[PDB]
Amino acid sequence: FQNVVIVTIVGWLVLFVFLPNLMIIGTSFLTRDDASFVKMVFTLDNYTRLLDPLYFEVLLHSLNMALIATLACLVLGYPFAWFLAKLPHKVRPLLLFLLIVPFWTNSLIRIYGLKIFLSTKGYLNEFLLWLGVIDTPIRIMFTPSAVIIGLVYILLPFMVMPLYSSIEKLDKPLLEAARDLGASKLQTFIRIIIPLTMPGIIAGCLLVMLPAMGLFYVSDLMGGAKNLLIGNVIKVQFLNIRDWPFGAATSITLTIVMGLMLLVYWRASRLLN
């Protein structure tokens, strides 16, 4: 009873999470084989292939797109969480539940609908032209702006909740003391509120950034052939080319950033207390 559930959950997690992760982390140090996908030869040829400009230019573009999407999510989500906490407590769960209702429809259908809504001859251009604000139709498809907009639209709710949890747990008398001591909104926000909510920011950034570089359908539908993410390369290597060690080597760059962000989160949590 006391230990049975712990043993069950630990066994499940070990079998389904870390054992396959260690299996893949060793797959990069293998040799391509057409029979069993692996040959027990310890070679480093997989990693040095990533240093070619062709296989390096895409990584930087994906990193830039993810950074812009994460920053946009932060800027659009921090005010939303702050303003939600300043509302009557009888309406908070209702507004916090409406952020999830759109998730019931599949993400691919929503991305397709957004693609239709932003088309050159479609809506948001005829409407913006009938009421005169812009002279010519706006062309946004097959550009990084479309990819960033889609990523922000898909992954926005995943960042608001940690920020709301961090904000709602704040101590009210701490802000009152700052106001009494002679602090305006700006100085308070810089030097008291923001330091106390760093773990929420780090958690939101972790939840927004890493998924944003594995979403291949967004780039496939609204990015084109010049705007590619890591997920597209990984899918091509794992389902068409059948070069598994290359995908295993590529995933290590994704794991390293996660480890670094986890370390930053741990140091921030230690310093906060």
Binding site: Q2, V5, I6, T8, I9, W12, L13, F16, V17, P20, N21, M23, I24, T27, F37, L76, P79, F80, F83, L84, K86, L95, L98, I100, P102, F103, W104, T105, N106, L108, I109, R110, Y112, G113, I116, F117, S119, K121, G122, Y153, L156, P157, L206, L210, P211, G214, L215, F216, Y217, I230, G231, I234, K235, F238, A248, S251, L254, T255, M258, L262
Partner: protein
């Protein structure tokens, strides 16, 4: 004034594509760029499609099963973590935090590699296990967070009053955790109805799901039958969530 405007703008930005899909469901244009009258042809055409309906049924059943199993396991784990006090609790907390903050592509790749090595054909079992695995942490977090809304000394009072370990769970812990259990089931159902990466990686030809069918139709072109299916599923999920809430309360 300006606060409500910002909140309304965010909500509209989040909700505009859904209204567009719903409107284009009853539209007449095949591409759906413009509006050319009101028809009901798309619903009739969808009613005769077989693969799409099979994919929708498979997706709904998969979501229900995964949500149930994940809710059960997560509730048990959260109760175990809260009831017993030990030095290893932060270790399990960090374990679940790390498994929560992991990329979808890496998890899908690892699960595919493990299943290929083990010698298991892809299909129902692989998809169900992957869905349970990636839906586990959220239910644990929800039930774990809810429990500390009450004092811990209540269990000691029950022990002093003459209560066994089995009666405590039935008569105290479960009454106070049912609202959290329902929330976990609803959240698990929502997550499993939107995943496209893991499902696209660990699926098989025998079991066909809605994301894969839509992705296949994308290359050639999609019809407003997808719109009709989407609005029907929206209505079904809307009645399902209120039914679950009524059952919980």
């Amino acid at each position: 004034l300006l606060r409500g405007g910002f909140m309304t703008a965010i909500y509209a930005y989040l909700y505009i594509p859904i209204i567009i899909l719903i409107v284009n469901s009853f539209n007449s244009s095949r591409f759906g760029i413009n509006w050319q009258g009101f028809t009901t042809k798309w619903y009739s055409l969808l009613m005769n499609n077989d693969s799409l309906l099979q994919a929708a049924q498979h997706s709904l059943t998969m979501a229900v099963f995964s949500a149930t199993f994940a809710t059960l396991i997560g509730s048990l784990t959260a109760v175990a973590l809260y009831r017993y006090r030990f030095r290893g609790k932060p270790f399990v907390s960090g374990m679940l935090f790390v498994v929560m903050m992991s990329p979808d592509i890496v998890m899908a790749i690892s699960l595919l590699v493990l299943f290929m090595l083990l010698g298991i054909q892809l299909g129902f079992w692989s998809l169900l296990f992957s869905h349970i695995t990636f839906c586990l942490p959220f239910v644990v977090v929800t039930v774990y967070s809810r429990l500390k809304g009450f004092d811990v000394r209540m269990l000691e009072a029950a022990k002093d009053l003459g209560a066994s370990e089995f009666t405590i769970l039935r008569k105290i812990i479960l009454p106070l955790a049912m609202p959290a259990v329902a929330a976990g089931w609803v959240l698990s159902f929502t997550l499993s109805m939107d995943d496209v990466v893991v499902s696209s990686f660990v699926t098989g030809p025998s079991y066909e799901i809605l994301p894969l069918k839509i992705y296949s139709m994308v290359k050639v072109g999609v019809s407003p039958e997808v719109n009709a299916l989407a609005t029907i599923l929206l209505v079904l999920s809307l009645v399902m969530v209120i039914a679950s809430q009524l059952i919980a309360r």
